[PDB]
Amino acid sequence: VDTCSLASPASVCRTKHLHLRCSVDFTRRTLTGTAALTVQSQEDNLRSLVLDTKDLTIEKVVINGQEVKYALGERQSYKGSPMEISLPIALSKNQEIVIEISFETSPKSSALQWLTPEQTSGKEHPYLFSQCQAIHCRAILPCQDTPSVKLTYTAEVSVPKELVALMSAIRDGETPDPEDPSRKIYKFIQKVPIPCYLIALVVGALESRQIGPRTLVWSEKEQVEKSAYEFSETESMLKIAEDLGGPYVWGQYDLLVLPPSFPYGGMENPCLTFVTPTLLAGDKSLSNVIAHEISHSWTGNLVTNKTWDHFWLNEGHTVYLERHICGRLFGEKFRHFNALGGWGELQNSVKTFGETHPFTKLVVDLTDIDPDVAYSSVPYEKGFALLFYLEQLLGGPEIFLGFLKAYVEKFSYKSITTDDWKDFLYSYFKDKVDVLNQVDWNAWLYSPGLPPIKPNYDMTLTNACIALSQRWITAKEDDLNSFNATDLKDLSSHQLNEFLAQTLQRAPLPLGHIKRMQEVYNFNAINNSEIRFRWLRLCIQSKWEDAIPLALKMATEQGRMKFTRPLFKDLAAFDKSHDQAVRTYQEHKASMHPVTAMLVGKDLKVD
Ligand SMILES: N[C@H](CC(=O)O)Cn1nnc(-c2ccc(Oc3ccc(Cl)cc3)cc2)n1
Ligand SMILES: [Yb+3]
Ligand SMILES: [Yb+3]
Ligand SMILES: [Yb+3]
Ligand SMILES: [Zn+2]
């Protein structure tokens, strides 16, 4: 049962297709139009159906050219309001009908961020972007808002003529709007069935540059050149991913670099991956995010979790595939380094939630839980650790990659549960069932805390990070003069980041140690967002007042939640910055992404 949805389940009726015709009104901050759903009954004598909606204004519902009766139920907090539609004629099993809903979104839609010209790079045009994952598609249009249902889609999007619309689909032309010459209509087609959380829309002053045979990079003019260089390894990663997962079925693999308020590192929107501009390090060092989004074209987009309780299936396998891509490009020692780093992030999440917390379980129960509030590294890293443990138990990466490719082939275009995955794992590894029966399944899948077994990790690249972190932690005042810029000479950006993550795990350090670290390593000069974030957290947690304006500027000049949420929490925990953190959130709240504003508010205990 999908406990996050109020719609009729897949066992009652299934949406097969969506034909969306809408107009983006920047003056009213509304998306207005019609959502024509092709629905197939799964039952005899079907007379009504229920859809998910959230803050939607419904004008009318048309079936067979006539208006029908519908009713909106009472709002159920973050789930929204159920929409019951009375069918004009009873449907037989497998019968399909088209339901056309005339609707309008709220300016406060939790799926959307409306940006004024001043919040963009160009300063002349506004911008709009969506983020449906997990359950925000219902805040854009009426739908069965559940990943247990897969549908194809077509769309016609009217926008001011000076702007460009893009979707999670193949571009199908553009024409001037026949109703308004100041507007253009952009057309789109998504021929592969997808869960509704993969529907995405961006409208802005966008330009593109080709970077591969099947890839364009899109952004505002100011970011095009830097993005083309930053993401130049994309095609090489797509080739490795095809070798590991089988055919890439989506046609195009484009990238869109969003404005800084984009709330996540990326979004695996089919045909058009969305990315944070915080990846623009200048040296391609944050390209594992591209490898992760590319991987989702198999794990997540083809093989989807049936409900949000099984989200680890999506993430665990994606991180697993991501780490193999980076291991093929940079070596097996690099794959072990990234995997060991992941275990450390899992340790941090478990410590933050508490070792008995229900969100530290691999398979969760989201009944009455806002999925955005449950979001953490647990499904990613505890899911990756399980797969990495099984890889070692079952004979190594070559054998386990055979399972991964067979798993994708088996479940492509389907929505599955942990039991479907486990059953297939046992089926594929039938000759190793005795080995599989030694796994503590109940602990791995259903128990909170760190997993029952830690995998084996090559330490080659991690050793220097640990050694330097330990020198700093054990140093007394009279040892501070021994540190010098030469300590960092043989460290890659990845190793510098790991040195900071290891040190941050033992924070606070004495204030004098942090001041010396800035004196000798000049970490304040580093623009790499991952490094800068860990360094600023280390300064704030070590009570360095000089770091306060730096941490506030980072928390506000970008909005990636991975960075913004811990920076505001650390700034609120430091007595010297507490009031500034609260005031800064208060002044920026109206202008923040709606999900980010809600979560930062909860973290700060500011209503
Ligand atoms: N998919 C993007 C690209 C990438 O992951 O690389 C990143 N992303 N964007 N949005 C979301 C997202 C995911 C899940 C959510 O609900 C939960 C949380 C935890 C659980 Cl156990 C179940 C359900 C809510 C939001 N994730
Ligand atoms: Yb066409
Ligand atoms: Yb079985
Ligand atoms: Yb000493
Ligand atoms: Zn992911």
UniProtKB/Swiss-Prot annotation:
InterPro entries: Aminopeptidase_N-like_N, Aminopeptidase_N-like_N_sf, ARM-type_fold, LTA4H, LTA4H_cat, M1_LTA-4_hydro/amino_C_sf, M1_LTA4H, Peptidase_M1. The keyword Transport does not apply. Its main location: cytoplasm. Changing residue 131 to A: Strongly reduced aminopeptidase activity. Strongly decreased affinity for leukotriene. Abolishes epoxide hydrolase activity. GO terms for cellular component: cytosol; extracellular exosome; extracellular region; ficolin-1-rich granule lumen; nucleoplasm; nucleus; tertiary granule lumen. Changing residue 266 to A: No loss of activity. GO terms for molecular function: aminopeptidase activity; epoxide hydrolase activity; leukotriene-A4 hydrolase activity; metalloaminopeptidase activity; peptidase activity; RNA binding; tripeptide aminopeptidase activity; zinc ion binding. The active site is at 293 (proton acceptor), 380 (proton donor). This is Leukotriene A-4 hydrolase. It comes from Homo sapiens. The lineage of its organism: Eukaryota, Metazoa, Chordata, Craniata, Vertebrata.
